[PDB]
């Protein structure tokens, strides 16, 4: 019975953390319909191009194509647009065998460990 109540409590906590994950998923899904989207695209694209030493090309959205246009015609970087990459940018570095993706859902998936470790003690402490 003690194992039953402990599994009940942890399985109740899991769906709460999952729906908070869904809320931040919709928060950064309905985010490009907002004028701070070119600013955040320029910021994360410059972070991807600087964390990749000497890139060659960049892959983005067509709608996200002009918003880094000032960074397009400097650094000597090729540009390309794809609709599959709905979020974030991609940087192909100097040969085609090294690639840096900077999607928003990707950043959520990378940082969600320490994010959840702070979220649980934030909303349960």
């Amino acid at each position: 019975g003690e194992l039953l109540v402990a599994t009940a409590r942890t399985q109740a906590r899991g769906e709460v953390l999952e729906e908070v994950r869904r809320r931040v998923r919709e928060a950064l899904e309905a985010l490009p319909q907002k004028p701070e989207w070119p600013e955040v695209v320029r910021k994360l694209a410059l972070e991807a191009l600087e964390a990749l030493p000497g890139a060659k090309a960049l892959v983005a959205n067509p709608e996200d194509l002009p918003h880094l246009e000032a960074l397009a015609r400097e650094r000597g970087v090729e540009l390309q647009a794809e609709p599959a990459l709905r979020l974030g940018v991609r940087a192909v570095g100097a040969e085609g065998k090294t690639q840096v993706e900077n999607s928003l859902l990707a950043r959520l998936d990378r940082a969600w460990d320490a994010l959840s470790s702070k979220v649980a003690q934030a909303l349960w402490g």
Binding site: L3, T7, R13, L17, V100, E101, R110, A120
Partner: protein
């Protein structure tokens, strides 16, 4: 952070693959591998250079082609997400849970290889444990903080002995003189290549004694991939060190079948063309077994403890093989099972001669269990070794040509094997075991008992076997 993919795998064979143009991968880093079907395998980086990099792959190597299968980076050093609400859960070899419950919320991220413990910041393993087994209580005493494995064969019941120790090990607080609380044991159960029958026995034993609310299991079945066996004991002992030294539990670690771990590292060390030690096992197997075993014991000023019981399957049931030999060089003591006593019908089949607890002298004696204990142990060993080496003399001159006291040793031997070793599933405390040892020592007169002092032999001698039970 940001996704860092590496295309350009040059070579894939066995457990290894090579990725070129890979400089931001660190040594010891963790990579994951995505093929064209979305299946994400894991792997660890084990050689880095400006030309290429070498990855050991933690799963099967089916469907990995070279035109695809990007290699991405995660956890620049290999870590494990550890928590305190981890004590009713099951995990696979990498640490992903297989119980239906959601993954845990990590309270820390500890490095999975584990740093070595400072010899100044240790503490003597001191406190007597009792395991209800008369051999491991009177003759080869386990104490809290010790690393003692069970050296066994192939048909021998080492798993039943480990489960019996796990279900009846209790410290004795009243004989020790530290008061009383009866703090029970958390159990960390790492298992590497348990088939289905051993796993069924262990989980039925744990759920029958009510221990799966105190235990955490890192399971690795026989058909699971044979490279995650390298990470299984290290992430078991990461959780054990966490629970003992940052929450002050009393963790007992059952490390099943270390011979499968050693053959897994033989596989990954023969994939890399490395010069071996003895019988094909690589030269650094001493260092790997040391970095696993030596992560146990007690520290100073802190309430915790990591006690270790590994289990070894000796291949040709000999002490000479590199796996049990190097194991016995790192660890402190062994409990060695004998096939010679198992065919006679004796459980637990422990012959006391090759088995030895090293630091028994820190947990026995006056004011800890009882003042006669070490001398009783020495006299039991002397008299039973006389019985064992007089059986050969009986075998080469026949039965009737014996002096008296030689038949008395020959009767001490089988009375020992049929009454002191041979018990059932019964839990016998240290007083029943000491009075059965004294009742067997009463079969020999004074003057042969030249290792027990005179006050002990004056106040304990003189009880037969018809008074220790009926």
């Amino acid at each position: 952070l940001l996704k860092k993919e590496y295309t350009g795998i040059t070579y894939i064979s066995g457990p290894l693959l090579f990725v070129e143009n890979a400089k931001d991968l660190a040594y010891g880093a963790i990579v994951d591998i995505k093929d064209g079907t979305g299946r994400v395998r894991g792997g660890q980086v084990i050689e880095v250079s400006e030309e290429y990099a070498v990855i050991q792959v933690f799963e099967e190597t089916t469907g990995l082609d070279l035109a695809t299968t990007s290699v991405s980076l995660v956890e620049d050093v290999a870590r494990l997400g550890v928590s305190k609400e981890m004590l009713g859960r099951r995990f696979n070899g990498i640490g992903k849970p297989i119980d239906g419950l959601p993954p845990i919320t990590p309270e820390k991220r500890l490095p999975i290889t584990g740093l070595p413990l400072n010899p100044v910041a240790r503490r003597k393993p001191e406190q007597f444990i009792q395991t209800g087994i008369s051999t491991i209580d009177v003759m080869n005493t386990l104490v809290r903080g010790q690393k003692l494995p069970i050296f066994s064969g192939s048909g021998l019941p080492a798993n039943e002995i480990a489960a019996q120790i796990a279900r009846q090990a209790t410290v004795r607080p009243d004989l020790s003189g530290e008061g009383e609380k009866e703090e029970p044991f958390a159990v960390v159960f790492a298992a590497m290549g348990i088939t289905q029958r051993e796993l069924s026995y262990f989980i039925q034993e744990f759920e029958r004694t009510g221990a799966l609310s105190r235990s955490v299991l890192f399971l690795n079945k026989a058909d699971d991939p044979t490279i995650e066996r390298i990470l299984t004991p290290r992430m078991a002992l990461t959780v054990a060190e966490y629970l003992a030294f940052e929450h002050d539990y009393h963790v007992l670690v059952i490390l099943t079948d270390m011979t499968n771990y050693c053959e897994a590292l033989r596989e990954i060390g023969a994939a890399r063309e490395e010069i071996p030690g003895r019988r094909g096992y690589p030269g650094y197997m001493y260092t790997d077994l040391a970095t696993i075993y030596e992560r146990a014991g007690v520290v100073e000023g802190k309430k915790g403890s990591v006690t270790q019981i590994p289990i070894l399957s000796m291949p040709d049931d000999d002490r000479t093989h590199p796996i049990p030999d190097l194991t016995g060089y790192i660890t402190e003591g062994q409990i060695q099972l004998s096939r010679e006593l198992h065919r006679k019908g004796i459980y637990p089949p422990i012959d006391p001669l090759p088995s030895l607890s090293r630091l028994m002298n820190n947990g026995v004696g006056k004011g800890k269990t009882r003042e006669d204990h070490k001398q009783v142990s020495d006299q039991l060993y002397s008299a039973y070794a006389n019985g064992v080496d007089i059986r050969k003399l009986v075998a080469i001159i026949g039965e009737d040509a014996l002096t008296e006291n030689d038949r008395r040793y020959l009767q001490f031997a089988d009375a020992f094997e049929r009454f002191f070793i041979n018990q059932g599933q019964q839990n016998r405390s240290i007083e029943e075991s000491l009075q059965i040892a004294w009742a067997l020592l009463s079969m020999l007169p004074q003057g042969e008992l030249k290792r027990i002092s005179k006050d002990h032999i004056g106040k304990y001698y003189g009880q037969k076997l018809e008074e220790i039970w009926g």
